[PDB]
Design a protein around this ligand. Sequence first.
Ligand SMILES: Nc1ncnc2c1ncn2[C@@H]1O[C@H](CSCc2ccc(Cl)c(C(=O)O)c2)[C@@H](O)[C@H]1O
Ligand SMILES: [Zn+2]
Ligand SMILES: [Zn+2]
Lengths: 115, 297
Amino acid sequence: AFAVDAAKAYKDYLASGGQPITNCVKMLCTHTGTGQAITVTPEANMDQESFGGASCCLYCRCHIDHPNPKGFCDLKGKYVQIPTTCANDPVGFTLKNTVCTVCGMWKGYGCSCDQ
Amino acid sequence: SQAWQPGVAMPNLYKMQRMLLEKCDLQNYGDSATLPKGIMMNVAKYTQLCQYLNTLTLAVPYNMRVIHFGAGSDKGVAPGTAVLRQWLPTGTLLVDSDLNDFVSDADSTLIGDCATVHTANKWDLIISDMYDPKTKNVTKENDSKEGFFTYICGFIQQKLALGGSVAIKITEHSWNADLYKLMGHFAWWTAFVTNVNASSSEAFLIGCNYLGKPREQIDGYVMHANYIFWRNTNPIQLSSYSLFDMSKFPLKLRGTAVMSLKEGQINDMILSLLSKGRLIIRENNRVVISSDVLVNN
Ligand SMILES: Nc1ncnc2c1ncn2[C@@H]1O[C@H](CSCc2ccc(Cl)c(C(=O)O)c2)[C@@H](O)[C@H]1O
Ligand SMILES: [Zn+2]
Ligand SMILES: [Zn+2]
């Protein structure tokens, strides 16, 4: 039943005051995009930064298996939009947040489906 | 007015000289451009390279096939690959590679010396950032370098589709005479300096629309001396300006025709279409790649 739980270890190291994972790949873009969370090309709006997806994935960056039966990555080969206020830690933000499956926005950071 | 361009291309008159090779001494050596907040040099550099490639007659077919050598950073990510994937049409097949391990947004990544990389298919665009800092030895004669340049020359001749294009990084000391000679096998060529990295002797040697035969005869020792002479006498103002206007960044999907033809069928009419960025000649089968692994104790 043993499985390394890297997501928990990183959250706990963040809460301990550890420096977030660096060198996530920030893209140049117009910042007039849709603002959706994970896209085929950079889609940051005025309130977001766009990053290369692989560089923002905990499992890619730590060289460990993705937590899924087929080992698939939702980020690699895509771009992830991160709120500018959270762009100091893109890995932590993708790890702690969820994409709304109807509108494609981050819940609590652009999703208005519940209002 | 160069400061608002993505960079500066070697002017044609400098290509026509017969200079002797000199040491490269850049007036703006050690200056740096102010990058936008949080943007890496490698992202800025590839963005400006792509902005310049937008001005050329690149063939852009459906199923475009692009391979990127030297794509790994010392932090284990691939910033240049991320820019290339942003630039290329959605659905473009992108393969990258580097000596050292890294994580990438490419469709497939091969780790190892580029001499171990083999592909079944031909390619529409080859990008190389490969560079060995051991070549920067100011205390010894600056001769043509082999290593990975030997691989790149053969890979162009064997695996670049007719009509395809290349951008290969060189510097004062990291260069190869045969690669310059191969520039004469394209419809057009230049050495392009990004405005963000203009304090460096690096340039990208760009071959535009491969013809598979010598269109012009180039002496690579002379041409590299011509390149250095240009750099020595034409200071380039460091500039980030073009990074702030990305409205027209994506490469235009031209739907360029792809045909399979055999050596005897390449006539002057075909060569003209190749030269205009209007034709790619290769098969359209599956893209299959591999890395040779040396097995030892
Ligand atoms: N024979 C060979 N076979 C395969 N690869 C080879 C090679 N000889 C050298 N290389 C590779 O060329 C690359 C040059 S640096 C490119 C780069 C990428 C990302 C960033 Cl972010 C930066 C940066 O820090 O600005 C720089 C290194 O990765 C080298 O491994
Ligand atoms: Zn991943
Ligand atoms: Zn929603």
